[PDB]
From a paper:
However, the vertebrate-specific CUL9 complex with RBX1 (also called ROC1), of interest due to its tumor suppressive interaction with TP53, uniquely encompasses both cullin–RING and RBR domains. However, the vertebrate-specific CUL9 is unique in encompassing two distinct types of E3 ligase within the same polypeptide. With 2,517 residues, CUL9 is the largest cullin and RBR protein, and among the dozen largest E3 ligase subunits, and its structural mechanisms have remained elusive. The CUL9 structure distinctly encompasses both neddylated CRL and RBR E3 functionalities within a single polypeptide, in a giant triangular, hexameric self-assembly.
Accordingly, a cryo-EM map revealed its triangular-shaped assembly with 240 Å-long vertices, measuring 255 Å across, with six inward-facing globular domains. Refinement, applying C3 symmetry, yielded a 4.4 Å resolution map revealing secondary structures for the triangular scaffold. Mass photometry and size-exclusion chromatography–multi-angle light scattering (SEC–MALS) validated the CUL9–RBX1 hexamer (1.8 MDa). One interface involves the cullin element from two protomers. This cullin dimer adopts a boomerang shape. The bends in the three boomerangs are the corners in the triangular hexamer. The second dimerization interface occurs in the center of each side of the triangle where ARM1 domains of two protomers interact. Moreover, AlphaFold2-modeled DOC domains fit into the six inward-facing densities in a manner compatible with the short tethers to the cullin element. Indeed, the hexameric assembly is disrupted by mutants in the ARM1 interface (R125A Y152A), or by eliminating the cullin interface through deleting part of the bridging helix.
Author numbering:
A (entry chain H): 21 to 35, 40 to 57, 66 to 108
B (entry chain G): 21 to 34
C (entry chain F): 1368 to 1434, 1465 to 1668, 1691 to 1739, 1750 to 1821, 1830 to 1836, 1844 to 1858, 1863 to 1902, 1921 to 1942, ...
D (entry chain E): 1512 to 1608, 1611 to 1665, 1691 to 1726
Amino acid sequence: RFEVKKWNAVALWAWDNCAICRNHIMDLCIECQEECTVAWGVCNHAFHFHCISRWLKTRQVCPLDNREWEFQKYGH
Amino acid sequence: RFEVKKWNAVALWA
Amino acid sequence: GKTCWEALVSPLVQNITSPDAEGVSALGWLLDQYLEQRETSRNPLSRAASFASRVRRLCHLLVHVEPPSSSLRNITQCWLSVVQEQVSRFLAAAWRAPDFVPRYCKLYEHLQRAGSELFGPRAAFMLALRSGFSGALLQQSFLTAAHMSEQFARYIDQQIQGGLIGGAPGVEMLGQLQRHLEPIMVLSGLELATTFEHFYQHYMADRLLSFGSSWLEGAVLEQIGLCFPNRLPQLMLQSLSTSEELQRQFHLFQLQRLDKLFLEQEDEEEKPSPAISILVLSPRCWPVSPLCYLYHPRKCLPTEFCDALDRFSSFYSQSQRRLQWTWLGRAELQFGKQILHVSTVQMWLLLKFNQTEEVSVETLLKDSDLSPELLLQALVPLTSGNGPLTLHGVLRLHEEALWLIPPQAYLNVERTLEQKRNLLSCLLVRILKAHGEKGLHIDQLVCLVLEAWQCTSTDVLSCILHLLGQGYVKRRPQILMYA
Amino acid sequence: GSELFGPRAAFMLALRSGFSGALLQQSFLTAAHMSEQFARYIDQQIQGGLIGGAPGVEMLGQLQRHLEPIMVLSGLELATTFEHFYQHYMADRLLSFSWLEGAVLEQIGLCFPNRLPQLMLQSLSTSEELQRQFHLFQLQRLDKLFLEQEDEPSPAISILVLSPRCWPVSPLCYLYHPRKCLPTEFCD
């Protein structure tokens, strides 16, 4: 016979417009509703530069995934 | 005989 | 003197650093011959040493007027062209040898030293060397870029494995590992980054599940982190730490529950176990195949284990996403005096063997309903030498700290990635054509293509960069213009 | 503490201050022995992790977990007496065998007042640069000799130079007469 002394198990947390201002993803910015370009970040979300400018000026985390927002500068 | 393949010497400066 | 130098030396450089019809300059040929003969020019009494001396003094004299200019720039671009030709020859020659990465690193070391000996230590020539290597890696086919990236990922994984597992040969190999990283880091900012990162994730996964996140993985990342475009590996590492924090919180939550129970009972009156640790992984960062899942957890696992798993799932639900359980993991078992270090499936089989004295494979095949290939992989160590299971499919005991884990199987490139890249390319071409002379800001175009997909933003950006290099599209700078 | 009061920072500060105060009210010889034991533990764990293959991962994980209590020594004379023994043991570790030393120093860095341990690693880097310069000098000299003339199977030796500011070497370990105890090619 065998006996278990320890163990480790694994599982995944299985579960798209500009959520922060809720306008359509490709549409314009409600605050100004037309000069906001879209912004991308390392955490792979797309938000309005207006939305993000304000929000970041308030708080310094990604509002969608709880990580320090980093303006994506690859490929640029 | 006995053959060396690499040596590392150590010195201080005074 | 300013007049004399600007008159005599300058057009001489501007002439000798001009490509011929074949594309070769005089100074280019000179440097090429130097690099070719450097190996055999180490005899103090030979013609080759004299050749090296001549070339060395000529170059030092030509650049000695320096501390842009017109003497620096031309010689710089010539050094660039010669490094590019050399590296491209090498890459075409050996992209399938089982010693490719080490020869690549030897090349980088030898060419950097040659540059320092020739032109002295100066800043811009190192940047020339880097740009040359880059341009050479870009002048390649897609299948070959894929194979090269896979070779890099395998090299890192194999070095870390050897250094951690092995003894003094390890610590020897490890300083070398640190040396060889600076050549690799030239990959950043190129297209190859995405495929290299994809390949790196796939080995870092198994390495983290075979051993906790050691110093080695964090150190390698603190060297080469800015190469990975989306920063996936850092997120896997951070995930392990977040999980330990969650373990702390679960302990506290248990205490609070028990306190409430004690209080209620106290008002009414007033009126030898297996340790288990859980790990949650975000599916945005780990490559967990759908083949690796648990579906009827009670059926395939013992009772108390499932009770603990249910309790933890209850906590995770109450704290806030459901928990999809997997067969990935590692366990330590006791069988006689010896200790065993096995994976999850191995522990499952060996625990099923706690009652019966012989196992027929078809029973377990029906029970698990998992891929029989992974069960074969699990059994091969177990049926191998020093294997507490003997195969006859009949399983029976044959009758030191044993480590029985299925070793890594490096993905052998034969193709799906090429299909994905080509499809993204044509979709982006259609999108650019539809917008005409207006085009878009790049981020808007990424949004459009991602919407049309129903893949990562970085993948689309990689396709965009490859197209730009091909010259189909040009940059206006926020917006991009097709041509 | 986390069970009794929940997650709060002020109680953690109280815990650290309590450990510090407990350490302080001790006789000198006890403090010296304690510092020596701490340094010996760190050295033993690192050396075992480097030589031991199969359980070395466990040792290294335990070391990273256990580093946190030792940070209490920052802001005491124990830091001064502990830097000394860390110097003595790290010298031998560096000579005999690295890359984990920097990792350890990245989190135990604040404890050392005079920062000598980092100075040792800086010294190693300087020695490497010096070797490169030496090679370039040799090439230059050969070039001058060839110009003057034309104007008409071996052991691999690497040399490491140490500074006396931040390196403990006992003068009993010196070598005085090289030709008396060395072959001729090495001496050359």
